[PDB]
C-alpha cells in the first residue's frame, strides 16, 4: 500500500490503513497534497561523476510518469545531451507538456558520448526524475530535472 | 517517523502552483497571464517539532510502494492518485453499513 502523511498539531505520523481514526477530517481535495523532495536535501553527492554514476541504462521496462503538485527549490539540477559514438541519440525527446524543473540555482549541462546500453536511463537507487510538476522513472533529453522522491500529505486546514 | 538519512535539510523552500487568492486585475487570462516560468508561488517552512526531516523520510519510505503502483498501471501519466486516496478515505468510514457504537462507524 501507498503511505500517507498525517500532520496534526504540528506532528507527522504515517496513516495506519489498518486503524481508523474518526477524528481525522478530510473536508476537501484541497487538503490533499503531493510534494517532491530533492535528494539534495538528504545529503547526496551533487558532483557530476557521482550523479551520473547513480543513473544507468536499461531496456524492457516502459517508462511511467506521475504528477506532483509542489516541489523543493534545487541548488543543483542536471541536463544531459548524450549521444552514442555513431551520433544517434541516447535519450528520447521530452514528451508534450514535460518542461524543465522550474527552480535550479545551478544547471549542470553534461555533453559527451557513451555506450548507452539500454532503451531508457533510470535511477539506480529507484528515485525519480523531477521535471516541471511531473516525476518520471526515466531521463528525457535536454530537459532540466532534479533528483527526488515523492511524499503524499493531508494538510490540516 | 524516524529520519534515517545521512543528512537532512531542515529548511523547506517550497514552490507550488495553487494561487494564493486575491488575483489582481485580469491577470488570470492566459493571454495576459505570466509565462510558464512565473506561475509559481514560493514559501519558507522551517523545521518545527522535527517535521521537515521526517517529511523527507516519509517520501523515501513512500518511493518503493509508489514504484510498484507505477508498475501495475499502464497509464503513461497517472494523475488520479490523490482522488483515489480520497475515495479510499471515504470507503474506509462509509463503505459498509454503519453500525452505531461500532469501531468502523464514525458517528457523533
Amino acid at each position, epitope marked *: 500500500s501507498i503511505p500517507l502523511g498525517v500532520i496534526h498539531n504540528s506532528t507527522l505520523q504515517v496513516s495506519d490503513v489498518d486503524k481508523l481514526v474518526c477524528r481525522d477530517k478530510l473536508s476537501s481535495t484541497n487538503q490533499l497534497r503531493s510534494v517532491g523532495l530533492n535528494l539534495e*536535501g538528504n*545529503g547526496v553527492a551533487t558532483d557530476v561523476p557521482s550523479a551520473t554514476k547513480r543513473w544507468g541504462f536499461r531496456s524492457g521496462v516502459p517508462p511511467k510518469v506521475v504528477n506532483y503538485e509542489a516541489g523543493e527549490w534545487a541548488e543543483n539540477c542536471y541536463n544531459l545531451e548524450i549521444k552514442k559514438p555513431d551520433g544517434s541519440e541516447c535519450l528520447p525527446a521530452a514528451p508534450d507538456g514535460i518542461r524543465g524543473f522550474p527552480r535550479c540555482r545551478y544547471v549542470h549541462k553534461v555533453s559527451g558520448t557513451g555506450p548507452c546500453a539500454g532503451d531508457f536511463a533510470f535511477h539506480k537507487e529507484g528515485a525519480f526524475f523531477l521535471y516541471d510538476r511531473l516525476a518520471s522513472t526515466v531521463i528525457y533529453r535536454g530537459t532540466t530535472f532534479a533528483e527526488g522522491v515523492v511524499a503524499f500529505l493531508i494538510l490540516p486546514q | 517517523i524516524v529520519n534515517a538519512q545521512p*543528512k537532512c*535539510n531542515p529548511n523547506l523552500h517550497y514552490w507550488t502552483t495553487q494561487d494564493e487568492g486575491a488575483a489582481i486585475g485580469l491577470a488570470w487570462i492566459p493571454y495576459f497571464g505570466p509565462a510558464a516560468e512565473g506561475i509559481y508561488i514560493e514559501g519558507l517552512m522551517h*523545521n518545527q517539532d522535527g517535521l521537515i526531516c521526517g517529511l523527507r523520510q516519509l517520501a523515501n519510505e513512500t518511493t518503493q510502494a509508489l514504484q510498484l503502483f507505477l508498475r501495475a498501471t499502464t497509464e503513461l501519466r497517472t494523475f488520479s492518485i490523490l482522488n483515489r486516496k480520497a475515495i479510499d478515505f471515504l470507503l474506509q468510514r462509509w463503505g459498509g453499513t454503519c453500525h452505531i457504537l461500532g469501531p468502523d462507524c464514525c458517528i457523533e
Partner: antibody, heavy 131, light 110 residues
C-alpha cells in the same frame, strides 16, 4: 549538560609564545569539529582556526593574519584541544573563545559544504600583549 | 572572501516591540547564516542555525527568515533579558576574515 573551559591566558610580550588549553565535557568529542574564535576589544568576532575530527581526516585550517604563527592540536583521550601561539604580534591581543561543531549539526548541513555552525561556546580566556 | 554586513549598527526599542535586524552577504549563500546572542561579559549563545531554525531552548519570540544574499532576524515582543549584541555568521565556505558580522547591539527603551 555540555560545558567547555578555556585556560592558559595571560600577559605575553610581543614576539613570544603562549599555549592555550580547551577542556570539553558533555558530548562525543571524537566526532565533533573544534574551532578557535577570538574577539578583539574593538573589532568584534574574528575566526581563528578549525580542526576536523579523526573521522574526516582531522585537517586543520587557519585564518589569513594567523597562518604560519599558530598551531592547533587535539587529544581525544582527554577531550582537550590546544592552541599554540608563536611569533605573536600586538594585534593578536584578544579574548579567545573555544567552540565546538557537534555531530548533530553535521547532520543538518545537506549541501556538504565545509563551513560549520558554532554550537556551544566556553567562558573564554584573556590574552594581552603589550610592552 | 565572503563579506557580511549587519544593519543597523545600534538599535533602541521598547519592551514588546517587533525588532528586525538585516544581514547582507557579498556572494551567493543558500541559508548558511547563523544568529548568535552575546550578552555583555558572557560568551555568544547560539540562537538560530541555518535559516528560521531555533536552537532547542531558545524562546519562541525569536524567528529567522530569508535566503540568498539578504537575511532577517525578528523578535516579536522584546523582553528585558533580550538585551544583548547579536551576530550573524555564514557557514557556506571555509570562514574568511570577515565571516562574522560587525554586530548589532539592541538597546531597551523605557
Amino acid at each position: 549538560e555540555v560545558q567547555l573551559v578555556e585556560s592558559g591566558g595571560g600577559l605575553v610580550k610581543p614576539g613570544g609564545s603562549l599555549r592555550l588549553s580547551c577542556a570539553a565535557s558533555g558530548f562525543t568529542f571524537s566526532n565533533a569539529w573544534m574551532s578557535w574564535v577570538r574577539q578583539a576589544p574593538g573589532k568584534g568576532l574574528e575566526w581563528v582556526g578549525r580542526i576536523k575530527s579523526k573521522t574526516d581526516g582531522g585537517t586543520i585550517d587557519y585564518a589569513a593574519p594567523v597562518k604560519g604563527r599558530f598551531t592547533i592540536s587535539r587529544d581525544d583521550s582527554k577531550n582537550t584541544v590546544y592552541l599554540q601561539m608563536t611569533s605573536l604580534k600586538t594585534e593578536d591581543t584578544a579574548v579567545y573563545y573555544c567552540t565546538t561543531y557537534t555531530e548533530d549539526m553535521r547532520y543538518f548541513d545537506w549541501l556538504l559544504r565545509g563551513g560549520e555552525t558554532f554550537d556551544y561556546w566556553g567562558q573564554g580566556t584573556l590574552v594581552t600583549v603589550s610592552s | 572572501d565572503i563579506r557580511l554586513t549587519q544593519s543597523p549598527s545600534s538599535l533602541s526599542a521598547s519592551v514588546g516591540d517587533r525588532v528586525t535586524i538585516t544581514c547582507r552577504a557579498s556572494h551567493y549563500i543558500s541559508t548558511y547564516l547563523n544568529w548568535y546572542q552575546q550578552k555583555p561579559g558572557k560568551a555568544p549563545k547560539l540562537l538560530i542555525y541555518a535559516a528560521s531554525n531555533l536552537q532547542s531552548g531558545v524562546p519562541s519570540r525569536f524567528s529567522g527568515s530569508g535566503f540568498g544574499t539578504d537575511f532577517s532576524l525578528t523578535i516579536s515582543s522584546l523582553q528585558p533579558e533580550d538585551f544583548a549584541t547579536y551576530h550573524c555568521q555564514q557557514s557556506y565556505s571555509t570562514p574568511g576574515r570577515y565571516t562574522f558580522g560587525q554586530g548589532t547591539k539592541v538597546e531597551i527603551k523605557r
